[PDB]
């Protein structure tokens, strides 16, 4: 009767005609916070933020519908460019914002670049223009998609593979992410969550080419809280046990992500850079390159503090910007985020959800029937 298309092009509001988007997985807080579910005070407080919640849920439903398409489309033989462009075009169509006029991408659309990270690369790879890389049968790809509505950013990610030998690695990381999500809640201490994530993940091992490898958490990667128009707040959620005693609090939003690896369990920056973000705390700089000054205005007027990638500049007709972009990075105005890799020959996997720590309940807003 009324369904999404292939690829997704139907405005999400057409599929939810009352303008209300579905809640994600709602979980009661445990023990001394269980009173929150039925507390009239906390229910009224939660209801004050109905528009915030509904925007978050719109972004999460777009995320689900686009990743459903991706899960059916992405296979060996597809190019990274066509996958990324397919995801991006679907997100923008569903939210109704082409993101070409100044300010339009800041209303709704991509929350950050599409991560398409293969094998020993765990994160922060996105093809730049002219990229010709095609997925192979023995690849393990992490697809990290961000959707925002009015600056409410849903960050959720999953891994795909086509050779069954990798399945235990994917299962390990999915299980570890789900254990971290289960531990999350008001007053939970992030370093203790990390220990639970680690215990679950390290209970897995995977045989690759005749040798058995323990699955190791990537110890220098972590989840984080999410702020308006800003993917990273000040709080971290480690994926190993640490003595970070920071607590989750009412009103927080967290990206609970875990990464597992058959290699060292540690990543370094390596490879072509595609991902960038304007720092809200950028210092004052006497910019002399005309092209750094013009590029900064393009960035502020189109992306604000949302992360962007090179192709997001290319599609705005920017052609001579790499000098200026590197200058804004060197001057501390824009941060760069190079691809992150474990050792050559290793395989890494990622699963991630966004959770809302509401006054009443925990909402795993990006949960779907897929993961
Ligand atoms: Mn992510
Ligand atoms: Mn994240």
Author numbering: 74 to 444
Question: What did the published study say regarding this structure?
Answer:
While this crucial step in protein maturation is executed by two types of methionine aminopeptidases in eukaryotes (MAP1 and MAP2), additional roles in disease and translational regulation have drawn more attention to MAP2. While MAP1 and MAP2 share the common pita-bread fold, the latter is additionally characterized by the presence of several insertions and a charged N-terminal extension, which consists of segmented regions of alternating poly-acidic and poly-basic stretches. However, the major determinant for binding to the tunnel exit is the MAP2-specific insert domain of ~60 residues, which is locked in between uL23, the universal binding site for nascent chain associated factors, eL19, and 28S rRNA helices H53 and H59 (also termed ES24L). Taken together, our data show that it is the insert domain that specifically directs MAP2 to the site of action on the 80S ribosome, either the PTE or the A-site.
In order to build CtMAP2 into the cryo-EM density, the crystal structure of CtMAP2(∆N2-73) was solved at 1.3 Å resolution. In combination, these tools allowed for a detailed structural analysis of MAP2 bound to the ribosome.
